[PDB]
Amino acid sequence: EQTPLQEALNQLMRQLQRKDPSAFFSFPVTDFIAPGYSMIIKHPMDFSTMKEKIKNNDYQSIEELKDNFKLMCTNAMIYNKPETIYYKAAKKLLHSGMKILSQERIQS
Numbered sequence: 001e002q003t004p005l006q007e008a009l010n011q012l013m014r015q016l017q018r019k020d021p022s023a024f025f026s027f028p029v030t031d032f033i034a035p036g037y038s039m040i041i042k043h044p045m046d047f048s049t050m051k052e053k054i055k056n057n058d059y060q061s062i063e064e065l066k067d068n069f070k071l072m073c074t075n076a077m078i079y080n081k082p083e084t085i086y087y088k089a090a091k092k093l094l095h096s097g098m099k100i101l102s103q104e105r106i107q108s
């Protein structure tokens with residue numbers, strides 16, 4: 001029995017992962033795939049961690065999920081140089097994901 005907020009966050013997640021066809025952001029980045037990663041990135045984030053937070057009722061709002069999504073993409077721009085495939089992928093995903101997540105206030 002999931003809450004309406006959990007349901008809403010799951011639906012946003014399905015849309016966001018469709019914008020990552022290479023699966024670069026599905027799971028945590030290890031020091032084996034990315035030498036020295038843990039030496040540089042001190043606040044890691046990825047889509048599997050976000051899904052576990054949803055399941056554990058660790059989100060209070062869509063805002064919180066959007067900020068963790070931003071943190072995941074910004075981390076790739078700190079660790080990887082601008083010329084690399086991972087920096088370019090992060091920029092593309094940040095922009096398409098924010099088109100999904102951003103919206104106008106809704107007033108009564």
Ligand SMILES: COc1cc(-c2cn(C)c(=O)c3cnccc23)c(OC)cc1CN(C)C
Nearest residue numbers: 022023024025027028029033034076080086
């Ligand atoms: C090339 O394959 C992968 C690359 C990355 C990867 C991601 N990001 C965000 C990086 O910053 C990054 C930086 N340097 C090296 C690698 C990566 C990955 O991370 C979980 C998983 C795979 C496995 N693949 C079958 C999907």
Ligand SMILES: [Cl-]
Nearest residue numbers: 023026027028
């Ligand atoms: Cl992987």
Ligand SMILES: [Cl-]
Nearest residue numbers: 090091094095
């Ligand atoms: Cl950007």
Ligand SMILES: [Cl-]
Nearest residue numbers: 091092094095
């Ligand atoms: Cl940009």
Ligand SMILES: [Mg+2]
Nearest residue numbers: 061062063064
């Ligand atoms: Mg708020």
Ligand SMILES: [Zn+2]
Nearest residue numbers: 063064066067
């Ligand atoms: Zn915020």
Ligand SMILES: [Zn+2]
Nearest residue numbers: 091092094095
């Ligand atoms: Zn940008």
